[model samples]
Target: RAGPVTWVMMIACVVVFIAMQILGDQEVMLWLAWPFDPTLKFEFWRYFTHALMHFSLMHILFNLLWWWYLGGAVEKRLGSGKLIVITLISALLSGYVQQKFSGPWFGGLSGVVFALMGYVWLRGERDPQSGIYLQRGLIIFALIWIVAGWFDLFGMSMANGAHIAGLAVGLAMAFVDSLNA
Candidate 1:
């Protein structure tokens, strides 16, 4: 079973998706874009909330799947607080990187998705007693996808910078957790 944070996050993604469709993507995306100039002081939430502003059907589907799967594992085993910290740091850092690379136009849960995936994989590996590690096959699959994104394999504009940053956030956190464990 998925934890409350995962369920709530999944719903937030879908809810934002629907609102974007109804309200118009162009306007909403700009509004939610990372802080810029005058907005920087007031729109601080842009750092993390942008993760809730996914772009397309496939984007949301892919992110939600991984988020639920790996995120659930982390929350259930390590605790909801751990999952929340991972999400917060990953989302903020990923958003910052993506904005720096692409001018604040990108939006999606992919960063958080990758972070959760990394946490689950490493935590499970270094601390097997945690009972939350991802299988090697899944980790390989995600890495392949990340590489494909950087290469623009399918012509989709991938936020490669954000992906890398998010992965780092997860790996670092899990590493610390391993040492403390």
Candidate 2:
């Protein structure tokens, strides 16, 4: 089913998070993460590999949850291939965004989750016949959260850069797919 990839990706992240508990976040971050400029060190893998890293239990928990729910929608309706590309695309874009704005220390799947949501949102908006479904208000609510993340109002600094970049990639992807439809 569409959920298979979601579950697989979820398990992958969860396992990695657990390993971080055993292996240490600093080690993972040092090996997997990029610096302010990934191009300088020639660590091209860090572009998307940072997505495989997480810094907190709460971080991985919420990220995997949303990824499972929203990613299932996209994987099911758009197929596994689409989900793969979207995942990779958002990872690269969001990772770069966070690295540029917040330095290179950020890591989480939140951006990927946001990308999944935006993909569903735009798909439902422009191509109703695509078999994708998302509530109007929930999409708007998520969008508002992205806006709120800018100010870090709750005192927690999140990966707002990745979130914005992910949403952008998702909407753009959906728009291009609409053309093929």
Candidate 3:
């Protein structure tokens, strides 16, 4: 059964994908042309909206796949309220970090996707009842990706800053949620 939050995110992702595909790179200047101009030329929503945009099919597919996997499980366990809160928090933080460090021509749900993985991994360790399990191989894989970004060994432009920041915030939020529970 699709919950309200899940449906919302899914629809939003589709909309963003279409918009970005149609706009292409120009979407960056048309929408995310802010903070760089520093003249109130762009709308304020770009900061968060950029998270939904993507430049390539692979990028959107990868993020949406991870989101469906991790986000669906998270929603099932934590309920819609907590899931939405975590997503919004992670998205905002990731977007802010990316915008601050990287150029304005960036978009994707990767940061928040990594954040979800980080949150699930950490929380799964704390509570087995959460129904989320992280195998050693998965940990190793995640570590490889994270470390690869740090070293920039490949010619890929992995947004490590946003990934780390999102992970930190997501894990922190999970910890706080556990305390309240």
Each prediction's whole-model lDDT (CA): 0.87, 0.83, 0.74
lDDT (tens digit, per residue) of candidate 2 on 91-151 = 9999888888879888888888788888888888899998986797778888787878888
- How well does candidate 3 match the true structure in TM-score terms? 0.86
Q: Model 1, 104-178: lDDT tens per residue?
A: 788999998888878888888899999888888999998998999989996889999889889888989999999
lDDT of 2 at 29: 81
Question: In candidate 3, which residue ranges exceed 4 Å CA deviation?
Answer: 32-34
**lDDT of candidate 2 vs native?**
0.83
- For model 3, how does the per-residue alpha-carbon lDDT over 1-181 read when each residue is reduced to its tens digit? 3667766786787887786667666754466532556675356776666667777778878778778877888888778987787887887788777767785666677778778878888888777777875577876777787898888876778777678888888788767756765
List CA RMSD, all candidates: 1.2, 1.9, 2.3
| Best-matching candidate per lDDT | 1
Estimate the TM-score of every prediction: 0.96, 0.91, 0.86
Number of clashes recorded per candidate: 0, 0, 0
Ranked candidates (TM-score, high to low)? 1, 2, 3
Model 2: colliding residue pairs? none
